[PDB]
Homo-oligomer: A and B are copies of this chain.
Amino acid sequence: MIQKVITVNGIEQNLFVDAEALLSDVLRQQLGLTGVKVGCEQGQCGACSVILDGKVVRACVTKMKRVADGAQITTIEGVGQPENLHPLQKAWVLHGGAQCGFCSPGFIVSAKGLLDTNADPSREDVRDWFQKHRNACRCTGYKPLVDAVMDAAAVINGKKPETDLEFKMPADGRIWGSKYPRPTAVAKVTGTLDYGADLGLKMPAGTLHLAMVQAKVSHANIKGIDTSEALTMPGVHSVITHKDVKGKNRITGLITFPTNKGDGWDRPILCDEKVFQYGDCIALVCADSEANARAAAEKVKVDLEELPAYMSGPAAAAEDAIEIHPGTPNVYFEQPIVKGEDTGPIFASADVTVEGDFYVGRQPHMPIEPDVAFAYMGDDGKCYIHSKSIGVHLHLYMIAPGVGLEPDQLVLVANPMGGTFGYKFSPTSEALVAVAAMATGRPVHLRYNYQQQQQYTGKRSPWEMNVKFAAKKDGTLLAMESDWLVDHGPYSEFGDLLTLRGAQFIGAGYNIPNIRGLGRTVATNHVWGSAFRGYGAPQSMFASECLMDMLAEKLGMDPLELRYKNAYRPGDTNPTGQEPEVFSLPDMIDQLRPKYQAALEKAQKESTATHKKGVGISIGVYGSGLDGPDASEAWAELNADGTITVHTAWEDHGQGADIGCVGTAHEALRPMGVAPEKIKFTWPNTATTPNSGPSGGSRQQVMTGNAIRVACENLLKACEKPGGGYYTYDELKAADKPTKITGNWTASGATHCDAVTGLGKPFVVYMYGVFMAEVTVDVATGQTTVDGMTLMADLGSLCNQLATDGQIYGGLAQGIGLALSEDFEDIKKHATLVGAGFPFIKQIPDKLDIVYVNHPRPDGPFGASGVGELPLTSPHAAIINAIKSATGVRIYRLPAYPEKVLEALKA
């Protein structure tokens, strides 16, 4: 051990450390500076950025031996605090740079380092700095972060007053549609919002820390578990196995479709008889620290009989493949789509037909924060779980029978969280922590490292797809045929539903009167399927949007004009036979057309012999809602202090559940003149907030926004004075009148798609958009650079523009990754950010352009649709279409790795 006397955030610290200890651990654990965020732990994400003697360093790869006596360290806590914000922190708030907020401390500390060395950076200087220092963000698409740095710099430079970093009220008093900052922004930019790992450090002594004993093969029969050596190791309390589970030891898919050939009870909590994928949790070590639990987990011995593993959909779907779940065929679900007339004769007599085989793979979510959860037994006797769940009520019912509790004896709470992008539509660690809390009676905390986040959370499910179009010479679509095979890994939850998305969204955007297709879901031993932003649309619309360009090519027609010819107009129906609710695609195409023509001319002009530029187009469509007559509930409560609490379980991945609630409530409460800062939101809790539903399907703004609106309308009625005006809280209480008022809303016009035909009216509100990608391909290397993205977006009406701009930029950046670099195919190689192709700042263009063409929705609150998944529906199709424009080569199977592009160029 060594004494080190240093200065941290301006205060002398008399430190006692192991010279080999990581600065991240010293700062977080010994000094309580949990504003230093840790994600990857491998020096790749910048979340743990600190200033050390004037240099920006990653604390997770800086050992204490590199910290000299007398060193100066700055963390986010030293940059500024609430009520003493630094210009960078104020700028971040104003520009909406904190979505999940997990990367915000690291970017802000890094930016301070930049500005202390270059006071007046160009935007490119800012981008080069964040690239060098590996500052990674999965939510924002980087542009808002650069905007914030530039604005702060101008203030620091005296070019602009600091008061301009403070939001100015529009002065109609209206925050709906504005750039009003989100309530959680100040906590995020100051490192004072506690995420799950932070909470773990601030839990009491006697909390047990868990480590997972995981399968190191993809498929096996388990013969036994030997824990004897692990029990003798430092700090070890006990080891938990399936024997300690008090219920069924299975997670239920809950809404398994009746025509599914499996019962939906296939997923174990702790493996008993079998390993179904690499990473499966077989046991939990409980110890006094994460480090001691992990060390002991390495010594637990599992006796297994390894079995041949099926690592792709086609392999598992082979007629003779062995059943992974004995008693259920590997191909466990099929969804037909049968619209209009038989397609065979139409294809035979059509002027033109095209066909393609396409693939979209196992995209990894890659939030900067790896999965984390904890659980405890309340003094009320209930089991409490605090996790990254974005569907607390949904998960309660998925896990309760498995853990052996009635629903009233389990409570799920959503912690503040560093992004999910859908992986948290699935249970991950909730049932594991519940089992351990129940078995030990003690609080328990489980943190995944980044390798476990990659290997042992669910993934976008690969689809192998064949799609065909028949059309007239003038480009009018006559018919479509479609076939898709969905690789769902071993766990069925929502796999059938994901397969149904193919019926709904393959070919969406156009009038197609005649469709014949079939989706099939197959169990495999690769990673299980969890929702990934877009949930079937990124697969579906990659195929159809690439195929539209192929059709345009074969007709000698411009691909934007082919889309214009076919885009939904009054009288048309979507693939499930439903009339669209608004018709904004022609408007958006017309407004994009001259920008598209200008982009074409620029690409022709600026192309060289070696660097070929191209422009690509696509349409995107997705529903806002879960299928059928989805519903939500909210409570609007006048508090004694005159503030109003709007109680919901709107789960915040980081998208803006807080500002969605405040903005929607503010608009609804305008008759009573309620200031936005007087409106409070609630963190999701199954015991004390209503069942607003999960934050999946780009649904909350519509469903919960409407419920909030109705609750607030009902609160206004409850407060109305006869003669005009409104009663105060005290007046209502004096008259023994209610102050906490419920509102509900249901999408009554919706119907579930039919099991035989696929036809129905699954959503009452959709999101519509038109993408344009501008790229350069180096034809010597095959490397593609995305130089610009544009999204024409119809969101109906904006609740908050900082929220919606950010959602779009983030989705476009994930599109670039999906198109060019991302996959989870190699269990080890793809288990790091860099290995799996995470997009760092230089991979995302600074030119991300949005044009809102909003057509108010009949059933949306104040006309709003959702936004969340719109920007990831088909940006990768636009990008691939742009590579084709540039070079003449079409990539059919994502991602467009350089070697793959080169092979195509040279064929």
Whole-angstrom distance between the alpha carbons of A357 and B754 in the complex? 109
Q: Are A31 and B32 touching (Cβ within 8 A)?
A: yes
Q: Are B2 and A199 touching (Cβ within 8 A)?
A: no
Min distance, Cβ A671 to any Cβ of chain B, angstroms: 29
Which candidate, A16-24, A144-152, A725-733, A735-743, is the interface stretch facing chain B?
A16-24
Whole-angstrom distance between the alpha carbons of A19 and B32 in the complex? 22
Q: Are B82 and A205 touching (Cβ within 8 A)?
A: no
Whole-angstrom distance between the alpha carbons of A377 and B206 in the complex? 28
Which residue of chain B is the closest to A204 with respect to CB atoms? B18
- Asked if A525 is an interface residue, CB under 8 A from chain B, the answer is no
For A289, the chain B residues whose CB sits under 8 A away are: 205
For A10, the chain B residues whose CB sits under 8 A away are: 82-83
For A17, the chain B residues whose CB sits under 8 A away are: 204
- Asked if A358 is an interface residue, CB under 8 A from chain B, the answer is no
For A13, the chain B residues whose CB sits under 8 A away are: 194
Which residue of chain B is the closest to A83 with respect to CB atoms? B10
- Asked if A342 is an interface residue, CB under 8 A from chain B, the answer is no
Q: Answer whether A3 and B291 are a contact pair too, CB < 8 Å, given A18-B204, A32-B32, A379-B19.
A: no
- Asked if A384 is an interface residue, CB under 8 A from chain B, the answer is yes
Which residue of chain B is the closest to A12 with respect to CB atoms? B187
Q: Are A443 and B16 touching (Cβ within 8 A)?
A: yes
For A413, the chain B residues whose CB sits under 8 A away are: 3
A190-227 residues with Cβ-Cβ distance < 8 A to B are 192, 194, 199, 202-206
Q: Answer whether A378 and B31 are a contact pair too, CB < 8 Å, given A14-B199, A235-B288.
A: no
Whole-angstrom distance between the alpha carbons of A30 and B2 in the complex? 24
A1-42 residues with Cβ-Cβ distance < 8 A to B are 1-3, 10-19, 21, 26, 29-32
Whole-angstrom distance between the alpha carbons of A11 and B188 in the complex? 12
- The one of B194, B235, B288 that contacts A14, using a Cβ cutoff of 8 Å: B194
Q: Answer whether A29 and B82 are a contact pair too, CB < 8 Å, given A3-B384, A16-B376, A16-B443.
A: no
- The one of B14, B16, B235, B378 that contacts A204, using a Cβ cutoff of 8 Å: B16
Binary per-residue interface labels of chain A (435-452) against chain B in the complex, 1 for a CB within 8 Å, 0 otherwise = 000000001000000000
For A15, the chain B residues whose CB sits under 8 A away are: 202
Whole-angstrom distance between the alpha carbons of A17 and B379 in the complex? 11
Whole-angstrom distance between the alpha carbons of A844 and B694 in the complex? 65
Min distance, Cβ A871 to any Cβ of chain B, angstroms: 32
- The one of B11, B18, B84, B199 that contacts A192, using a Cβ cutoff of 8 Å: B11
For A3, the chain B residues whose CB sits under 8 A away are: 384, 386, 413
Q: Are A30 and B202 touching (Cβ within 8 A)?
A: yes
- The one of B192, B204, B374, B377 that contacts A30, using a Cβ cutoff of 8 Å: B204
- The one of B2, B30, B202, B205 that contacts A31, using a Cβ cutoff of 8 Å: B202
Q: Are A2 and B204 touching (Cβ within 8 A)?
A: no
For A386, the chain B residues whose CB sits under 8 A away are: 3
Whole-angstrom distance between the alpha carbons of A377 and B1 in the complex? 6
Whole-angstrom distance between the alpha carbons of A377 and B13 in the complex? 20
For A1, the chain B residues whose CB sits under 8 A away are: 204, 376-379, 384, 443
Whole-angstrom distance between the alpha carbons of A16 and B16 in the complex? 27
For A82, the chain B residues whose CB sits under 8 A away are: 10-11
Which residue of chain B is the closest to A198 with respect to CB atoms? B14
Which residue of chain B is the closest to A64 with respect to CB atoms? B204
Whole-angstrom distance between the alpha carbons of A235 and B84 in the complex? 42
Q: Are B2 and A379 touching (Cβ within 8 A)?
A: yes
Whole-angstrom distance between the alpha carbons of A235 and B16 in the complex? 22
Interface positions of A (Cβ within 8 A of B): 1-3, 10-19, 21, 26, 29-32, 82-84, 187, 192, 194, 199, 202-206, 235, 288-289, 291, 374, 376-379, 384, 386, 413, 443
- CB<8 Å pairs between A and B, sample of 30: A1-B204, A1-B376, A1-B377, A1-B379, A1-B384, A1-B443, A2-B378, A3-B386, A3-B413, A10-B82, A11-B192, A12-B187, A15-B202, A16-B199, A16-B202, A16-B203, A16-B204, A16-B374, A16-B376, A16-B443, A17-B204, A18-B204, A30-B202, A31-B32, A31-B202, A32-B32, A205-B289, A205-B291, A235-B288, A288-B288
Of all A-B residue pairs in the complex, the 3 with the closest CB atoms, nearest first, are A32-B32, A1-B376, A30-B202
**Additional A-B contact list (11), CB under 8 Å, known A21-B204, A29-B204:** A13-B194, A16-B202, A16-B204, A16-B374, A16-B443, A17-B204, A18-B204, A19-B379, A30-B203, A32-B32, A235-B288
